Amino acid sequence: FHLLYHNKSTCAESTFEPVPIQAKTSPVNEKTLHDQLVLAAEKLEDEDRKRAAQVAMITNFVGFRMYKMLNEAGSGASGAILSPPALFGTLVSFYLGSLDPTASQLQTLLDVPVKEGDCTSRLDGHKVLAALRAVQGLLVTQTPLLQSIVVGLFTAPGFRLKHSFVQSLALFTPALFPRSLDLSTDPVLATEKINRFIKAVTGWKMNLPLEGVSTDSTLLFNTYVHFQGTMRGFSQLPGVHEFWVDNSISVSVPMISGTGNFQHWSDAQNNFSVTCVPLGERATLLLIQPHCISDLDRVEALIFQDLLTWIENPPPRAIRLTLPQLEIRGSYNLQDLLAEDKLPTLLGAEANLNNIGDTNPRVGEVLNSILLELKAGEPEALDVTLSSPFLFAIYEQDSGTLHFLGRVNNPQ
Numbered sequence: 001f002h003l004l005y006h007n008k009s010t011c012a013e014s015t016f017e018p019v020p021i022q023a024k025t026s027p028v029n030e031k032t033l034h035d036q037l038v039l040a041a042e043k044l045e046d047e048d049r050k051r052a053a054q055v056a057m058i059t060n061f062v063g064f065r066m067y068k069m070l071n072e073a074g075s076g077a078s079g080a081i082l083s084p085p086a087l088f089g090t091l092v093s094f095y096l097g098s099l100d101p102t103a104s105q106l107q108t109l110l111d112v113p114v115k116e117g118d119c120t121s122r123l124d125g126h127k128v129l130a131a132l133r134a135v136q137g138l139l140v141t142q143t144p145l146l147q148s149i150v151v152g153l154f155t156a157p158g159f160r161l162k163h164s165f166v167q168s169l170a171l172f173t174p175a176l177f178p179r180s181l182d183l184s185t186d187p188v189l190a191t192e193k194i195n196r197f198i199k200a201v202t203g204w205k206m207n208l209p210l211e212g213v214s215t216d217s218t219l220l221f222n223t224y225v226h227f228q229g230t231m232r233g234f235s236q237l238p239g240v241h242e243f244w245v246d247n248s249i250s251v252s253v254p255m256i257s258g259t260g261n262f263q264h265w266s267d268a269q270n271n272f273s274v275t276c277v278p279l280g281e282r283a284t285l286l287l288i289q290p291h292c293i294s295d296l297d298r299v300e301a302l303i304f305q306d307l308l309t310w311i312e313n314p315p316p317r318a319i320r321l322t323l324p325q326l327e328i329r330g331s332y333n334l335q336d337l338l339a340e341d342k343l344p345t346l347l348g349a350e351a352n353l354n355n356i357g358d359t360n361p362r363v364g365e366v367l368n369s370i371l372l373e374l375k376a377g378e379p380e381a382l383d384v385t386l387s388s389p390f391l392f393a394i395y396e397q398d399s400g401t402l403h404f405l406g407r408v409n410n411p412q
């Protein structure tokens with residue numbers, strides 16, 4: 001990963017109190033962000049594309065790792081979903097705000113050795129978030145794919161953020177909202193305000209956890225991801241259809257169906273099958289179905305383990321793929337997943353994050369919150385039908401990045 005480290009030349013503070021959460025705020029413009037993200041991806045050189053490749057490996061490794069900690073933490077009845085790039089960026093943001101021992105420990109969490117007595121063995125956050133942004137650019141370049149990330153920095157009254165830190169965050173995403181609110185006096189009310197505010201500026205209907213945060217918190221970092229996919233040549237089927245959550249629970253849900261030349265195969269060794277449909281010239285949706293429902297866990301553990309070498313490329317074939325229209329939501333506190341990962345205080349009262357503000361923040365939650373949407377774009381083939389729980393993943397052929405991976409036990 002040499003292109004992610006500080007160079008020999010690289011090895012050589014104004015603050016502010018964020019405006020009150022109440023303050024009037026022009027909403028996000030998802031298509032103004034998208035048009036800028038296109039620009040970014042199209043100016044990329046050969047150096048840039050190599051970095052993208054390198055950063056993707058760190059992202060994928062860390063992604064699986066934390067998805068496993070997610071399912072050990074319990075993800076909920078509906079299923080689970082994770083954006084490694086969103087996750088990765090969040091941890092890199094904190095890396096950029098940290099000093100040793102945290103700074104090193106964080107790097108070690110990203111499987112990047114910290115050679116003691118070596119600046120050049122340190123990750124360059126700025127270079128990394130740049131490369132990370134490239135990979136996001138590559139995903140969305142008819143506009144069939146749309147992904148928008150917005151970060152909310154929610155500070156306790158009085159606590160001041162360093163402008164340098166926020167500068168660094170802009171690389172990860174410009175859609176960046178630092179606001180101040182009383183987190184101590186009524187923690188439950190404060191959670192309503194953060195949820196109200198996010199829906200007001202993004203216009204996104206999302207998991208709104210109502211569980212308050214710690215009363216002594218002075219900083220809340222929250223990442224919000226919103227993905228929209230259009231499956232071209234797929235149409236919504238008449239009426240609704242049964243999706244068997246298990247032998248004794250049905251949910252009626254709208255399906256979408258498409259006929260195309262897709263790759264498909266059955267792993268007879270491990271009792272599951274896979275389909276690979278493209279989402280544009282780059283992106284690819286993977287759909288894994290266990291041959292039997294009581295095997296979901298095992299197949300999930302087995303297939304989301306990092307080298308993804310079971311992705312076999314056979315010739316495409318006529319496939320009538322039918323699946324539920326997806327409107328997935330998921331939300332979790334990164335602190336919990338590390339806590340399951342056994343280094344509970346990695347971003348814990350003991351963390352050295354003295355480059356975030358003019359005092360060392362007490363971090364109350366590091367939330368990733370997801371909304372994924374996959375929808376309809378408008379003789380004899382092989383019918384593939386997802387009417388029971390399955391796993392999915394959006395993979396990107398050029399960066400090799402797993403932008404999404406999760407499980408669908410039930411669709412709203």
